Design an enzyme around this catalytic site. Structure first.
Site, PDB file in Angstrom:
ATOM      1  N   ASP A   1      -1.872 -76.483   4.432  1.00  0.00           N
ATOM      2  CA  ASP A   1      -2.458 -77.275   3.360  1.00  0.00           C
ATOM      3  C   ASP A   1      -3.596 -76.500   2.678  1.00  0.00           C
ATOM      4  O   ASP A   1      -3.903 -75.363   3.035  1.00  0.00           O
ATOM      5  CB  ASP A   1      -2.937 -78.627   3.882  1.00  0.00           C
ATOM      6  CG  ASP A   1      -4.104 -78.526   4.852  1.00  0.00           C
ATOM      7  OD1 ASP A   1      -4.383 -77.432   5.379  1.00  0.00           O
ATOM      8  OD2 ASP A   1      -4.730 -79.567   5.081  1.00  0.00           O
TER       9      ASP A   1
ATOM     10  N   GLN B   1     -24.586 -54.813  14.204  1.00  0.00           N
ATOM     11  CA  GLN B   1     -23.339 -55.394  14.665  1.00  0.00           C
ATOM     12  C   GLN B   1     -23.416 -56.904  14.488  1.00  0.00           C
ATOM     13  O   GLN B   1     -24.387 -57.533  14.935  1.00  0.00           O
ATOM     14  CB  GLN B   1     -23.082 -55.054  16.135  1.00  0.00           C
ATOM     15  CG  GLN B   1     -23.007 -53.561  16.390  1.00  0.00           C
ATOM     16  CD  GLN B   1     -22.766 -53.252  17.856  1.00  0.00           C
ATOM     17  OE1 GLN B   1     -22.039 -53.973  18.540  1.00  0.00           O
ATOM     18  NE2 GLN B   1     -23.384 -52.184  18.346  1.00  0.00           N
TER      19      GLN B   1
ATOM     20  N   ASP C   1     -29.098 -54.695  15.544  1.00  0.00           N
ATOM     21  CA  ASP C   1     -28.258 -53.565  15.928  1.00  0.00           C
ATOM     22  C   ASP C   1     -27.145 -53.230  14.939  1.00  0.00           C
ATOM     23  O   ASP C   1     -26.331 -52.342  15.232  1.00  0.00           O
ATOM     24  CB  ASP C   1     -27.652 -53.793  17.321  1.00  0.00           C
ATOM     25  CG  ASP C   1     -26.750 -54.993  17.394  1.00  0.00           C
ATOM     26  OD1 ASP C   1     -26.506 -55.648  16.347  1.00  0.00           O
ATOM     27  OD2 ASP C   1     -26.277 -55.301  18.519  1.00  0.00           O
TER      28      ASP C   1
ATOM     29  N   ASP D   1     -11.302 -67.054  -2.052  1.00  0.00           N
ATOM     30  CA  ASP D   1     -11.094 -67.748  -3.316  1.00  0.00           C
ATOM     31  C   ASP D   1     -12.216 -68.740  -3.606  1.00  0.00           C
ATOM     32  O   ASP D   1     -12.541 -68.948  -4.775  1.00  0.00           O
ATOM     33  CB  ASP D   1      -9.718 -68.421  -3.384  1.00  0.00           C
ATOM     34  CG  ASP D   1      -9.412 -69.379  -2.226  1.00  0.00           C
ATOM     35  OD1 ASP D   1     -10.269 -69.617  -1.340  1.00  0.00           O
ATOM     36  OD2 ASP D   1      -8.270 -69.925  -2.248  1.00  0.00           O
TER      37      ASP D   1
ATOM     38  N   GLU E   1     -16.608 -69.845  -7.164  1.00  0.00           N
ATOM     39  CA  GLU E   1     -17.967 -70.258  -7.495  1.00  0.00           C
ATOM     40  C   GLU E   1     -18.707 -69.182  -8.283  1.00  0.00           C
ATOM     41  O   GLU E   1     -19.393 -69.510  -9.257  1.00  0.00           O
ATOM     42  CB  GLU E   1     -18.719 -70.644  -6.224  1.00  0.00           C
ATOM     43  CG  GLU E   1     -18.126 -71.883  -5.552  1.00  0.00           C
ATOM     44  CD  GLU E   1     -18.225 -73.136  -6.397  1.00  0.00           C
ATOM     45  OE1 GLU E   1     -19.142 -73.240  -7.209  1.00  0.00           O
ATOM     46  OE2 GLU E   1     -17.411 -74.042  -6.199  1.00  0.00           O
TER      47      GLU E   1
ATOM     48  N   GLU F   1      -8.516 -63.036  -4.798  1.00  0.00           N
ATOM     49  CA  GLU F   1      -7.808 -63.096  -3.519  1.00  0.00           C
ATOM     50  C   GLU F   1      -6.631 -62.119  -3.502  1.00  0.00           C
ATOM     51  O   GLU F   1      -6.435 -61.395  -2.522  1.00  0.00           O
ATOM     52  CB  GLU F   1      -7.331 -64.524  -3.264  1.00  0.00           C
ATOM     53  CG  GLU F   1      -6.761 -64.760  -1.865  1.00  0.00           C
ATOM     54  CD  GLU F   1      -6.481 -66.216  -1.602  1.00  0.00           C
ATOM     55  OE1 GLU F   1      -7.398 -67.043  -1.779  1.00  0.00           O
ATOM     56  OE2 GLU F   1      -5.334 -66.575  -1.219  1.00  0.00           O
TER      57      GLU F   1
ATOM     58  N   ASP G   1      -2.303 -66.137  -2.163  1.00  0.00           N
ATOM     59  CA  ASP G   1      -1.451 -67.267  -2.477  1.00  0.00           C
ATOM     60  C   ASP G   1      -2.000 -67.871  -3.761  1.00  0.00           C
ATOM     61  O   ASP G   1      -3.037 -67.437  -4.279  1.00  0.00           O
ATOM     62  CB  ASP G   1      -1.475 -68.281  -1.351  1.00  0.00           C
ATOM     63  CG  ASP G   1      -2.871 -68.490  -0.868  1.00  0.00           C
ATOM     64  OD1 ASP G   1      -3.631 -69.109  -1.649  1.00  0.00           O
ATOM     65  OD2 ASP G   1      -3.191 -67.979   0.226  1.00  0.00           O
TER      66      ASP G   1
ATOM     67  N   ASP H   1     -30.821 -58.183  11.358  1.00  0.00           N
ATOM     68  CA  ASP H   1     -30.051 -58.021  12.583  1.00  0.00           C
ATOM     69  C   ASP H   1     -30.555 -56.788  13.326  1.00  0.00           C
ATOM     70  O   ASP H   1     -30.834 -55.758  12.712  1.00  0.00           O
ATOM     71  CB  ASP H   1     -28.565 -57.875  12.263  1.00  0.00           C
ATOM     72  CG  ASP H   1     -27.720 -57.745  13.497  1.00  0.00           C
ATOM     73  OD1 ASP H   1     -27.295 -58.777  14.045  1.00  0.00           O
ATOM     74  OD2 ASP H   1     -27.470 -56.603  13.903  1.00  0.00           O
TER      75      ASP H   1
ATOM     76  N   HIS I   1     -11.658 -81.627 -11.477  1.00  0.00           N
ATOM     77  CA  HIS I   1     -10.890 -80.987 -10.413  1.00  0.00           C
ATOM     78  C   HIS I   1      -9.448 -81.482 -10.346  1.00  0.00           C
ATOM     79  O   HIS I   1      -8.665 -80.926  -9.579  1.00  0.00           O
ATOM     80  CB  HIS I   1     -11.542 -81.216  -9.043  1.00  0.00           C
ATOM     81  CG  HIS I   1     -12.855 -80.517  -8.869  1.00  0.00           C
ATOM     82  ND1 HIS I   1     -14.059 -81.128  -9.130  1.00  0.00           N
ATOM     83  CD2 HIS I   1     -13.150 -79.259  -8.465  1.00  0.00           C
ATOM     84  CE1 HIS I   1     -15.044 -80.278  -8.890  1.00  0.00           C
ATOM     85  NE2 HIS I   1     -14.517 -79.135  -8.489  1.00  0.00           N
TER      86      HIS I   1
ATOM     87  N   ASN J   1      -4.601 -62.213   2.341  1.00  0.00           N
ATOM     88  CA  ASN J   1      -3.627 -63.279   2.551  1.00  0.00           C
ATOM     89  C   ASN J   1      -3.478 -64.074   1.254  1.00  0.00           C
ATOM     90  O   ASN J   1      -3.735 -65.280   1.238  1.00  0.00           O
ATOM     91  CB  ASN J   1      -4.023 -64.224   3.679  1.00  0.00           C
ATOM     92  CG  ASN J   1      -4.358 -63.527   4.966  1.00  0.00           C
ATOM     93  OD1 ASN J   1      -5.533 -63.294   5.280  1.00  0.00           O
ATOM     94  ND2 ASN J   1      -3.339 -63.226   5.745  1.00  0.00           N
TER      95      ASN J   1
HETATM   96 CA   LIG Z   1      -5.884 -76.473   6.911  1.00  0.00          CA
HETATM   97 CA   LIG Z   2      -6.064 -69.083  -2.006  1.00  0.00          CA
HETATM   98 CA   LIG Z   3     -26.344 -57.924  15.920  1.00  0.00          CA
HETATM   99 ZN   LIG Z   4     -14.329 -82.940  -8.431  1.00  0.00          ZN
HETATM  100 ZN   LIG Z   5      -4.932 -67.178   0.784  1.00  0.00          ZN
HETATM  101 ZN   LIG Z   6     -15.653 -75.181  -9.401  1.00  0.00          ZN
HETATM  102 ZN   LIG Z   7     -16.943 -75.684  -6.079  1.00  0.00          ZN
HETATM  103 ZN   LIG Z   8     -15.942 -78.187  -7.585  1.00  0.00          ZN
END
Ligand SMILES: [Ca+2]
Ligand SMILES: [Ca+2]
Ligand SMILES: [Ca+2]
Ligand SMILES: [Zn+2]
Ligand SMILES: [Zn+2]
Ligand SMILES: [Zn+2]
Ligand SMILES: [Zn+2]
Ligand SMILES: [Zn+2]
Ligand SMILES: O[C@@H]1[C@@H](O)[C@H](O)OC[C@H]1O
Ligand SMILES: O[C@@H]1[C@@H](O)[C@H](O)OC[C@H]1O
Ligand SMILES: O[C@@H]1[C@@H](O)[C@H](O)OC[C@H]1O
Ligand SMILES: O[C@@H]1[C@@H](O)[C@H](O)OC[C@H]1O
Ligand SMILES: [Cl-]
Ligand SMILES: [Cl-]
Ligand SMILES: [Cl-]
Ligand SMILES: [Cl-]
Ligand SMILES: [Zn+2]
Ligand SMILES: [Zn+2]
Length: 316
Positions: free
Chosen positions: A200, A61, A59, A138, A143, A177, A185, A57, A231, A183
């Site tokens: 959601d 910024q 500058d 998160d 990951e 998080e 949760d 970059d 998952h 924020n």
């Molecule tokens: Ca959403």
């Molecule tokens: Ca979260």
């Molecule tokens: Ca820049």
């Molecule tokens: Zn999955």
């Molecule tokens: Zn959150």
């Molecule tokens: Zn995962």
């Molecule tokens: Zn993942």
């Molecule tokens: Zn995954």
């Protein structure tokens, strides 16, 4: 690169301003020299070649729209590094201060992000299902926690072991998080999922059934999709973790909550000392009970609450 450590400023995916550690050598690079062997963030330029170009970059910024995913990948890798170092005395994902490398603008309209064994990779989303995925702390920490798991227990990514693998990443993603006070949760991916829909997320740890995921062993998925439901069945362990931390009554079983810090210490010790590649849910319970015993004593409330929580989700 070799250069002078500097501090730039920019805005992330959600429009929030933050400072980022950079390195100056003609350009300002997203190279943070303050954490281990470095945090490096790269531009994949909408290709799938990795890592791409170290982010340069003019500058120091970083307020352009194109900059925002890079700002957040870089900043949240730093937060995740700080969490593991300051809370668990773990130096980067491998415990040996491995450099944390991230690429943003991976492919086009790519609705995913992943640890690939040597670096983080973030799609930008299609703008409807996801916005750029590094905007979720998160997601970033979930990951990177897969790397922690890979370098410790080596949990196999299928069936119950794979669901534990996913839950561990949801647990520490959430604890990061909360650590960041970004924020926080007990939901996953809420900051980058469905920008046109408020309230959601991809899944809930406090109430997995909100999105149809199981919250009890008797409701586990037993088919072959999703590598045996990694998952989906993670909700069973996510709910146990939530109960350990926050308490509650679940399927009639009352759990005395012990807080987030102790949840994290118990599961981190279980992961790093006791889990193996094929640990199942019952073996995770045993590892958590033993970990709480090591830390707090066999007659402690902490051990009792671990047992309550796994009872509540039907894991003996
Ligand atoms: Ca959403
Ligand atoms: Ca979260
Ligand atoms: Ca820049
Ligand atoms: Zn999955
Ligand atoms: Zn959150
Ligand atoms: Zn995962
Ligand atoms: Zn993942
Ligand atoms: Zn995954
Ligand atoms: O909020 C948690 C905090 O209480 C603990 O100290 O470190 C982990 C955080 O998630
Ligand atoms: O539904 C839960 C609510 O009861 C609690 O107050 O905070 C976390 C939420 O998930
Ligand atoms: O066995 C019962 C289980 O199947 C149900 O899901 O939760 C309550 C338990 O008593
Ligand atoms: O079929 C598997 C089931 O047997 C196990 O209990 O949970 C994971 C599933 O993939
Ligand atoms: Cl609830
Ligand atoms: Cl519930
Ligand atoms: Cl509850
Ligand atoms: Cl309930
Ligand atoms: Zn419940
Ligand atoms: Zn509940």
């Amino acid at each position: 690169i070799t250069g002078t450590s500097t501090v730039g400023v920019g805005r992330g995916v959600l429009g929030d301003q933050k400072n980022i550690n950079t390195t100056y050598s003609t350009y300002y690079y997203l190279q943070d020299n303050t954490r281990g062997n470095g945090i490096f963030t790269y531009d994949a330029k909408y290709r799938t070649t990795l890592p791409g170009s170290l982010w340069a970059d003019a500058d120091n910024q970083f307020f352009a729209s194109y900059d925002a995913p890079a700002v957040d990948a870089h900043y949240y890798a730093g937060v995740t590094y700080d969490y593991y170092k300051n809370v668990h005395n773990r130096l980067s994902y491998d415990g040996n201060n491995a450099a944390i490398r991230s690429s943003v603008h991976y492919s086009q309209g790519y609705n995913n992000a992943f640890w690939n064994g040597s670096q983080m990779v973030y799609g930008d989303g299609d703008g409807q299902t996801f916005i750029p995925l590094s905007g979720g702390i998160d997601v970033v920490a979930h990951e990177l926690t897969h790397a922690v798991t890979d370098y410790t227990a080596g949990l196999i990514y299928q069936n119950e072991s794979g669901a534990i693998n996913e839950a561990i990443s949801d647990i520490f993603g959430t604890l990061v998080e909360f650590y960041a006070n970004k924020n926080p949760d007990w939901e996953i991916g809420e900051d980058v999922y469905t920008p046109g829909i408020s309230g959601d997320s991809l899944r809930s740890m406090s109430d997995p059934a909100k999105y149809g995921d199981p919250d009890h062993y008797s409701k586990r998925y037993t088919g072959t999709q999703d590598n045996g439901g990694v998952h989906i069945n993670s909700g069973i362990i996510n709910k146990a973790a939530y109960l350990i931390s926050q308490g509650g009554t679940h399927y009639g079983v009352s759990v005395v909550g012990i807080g987030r810090d102790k949840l994290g210490k118990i599961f981190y010790r279980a992961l790093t000392q006791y889990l193996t590649p094929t640990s199942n849910f019952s073996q995770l319970r045993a590892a958590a009970v033993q970990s709480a015993t090591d830390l707090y004593g066999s007659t402690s409330q902490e051990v009792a609450s671990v047992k309550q929580a796994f009872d509540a989700v039907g894991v003996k």
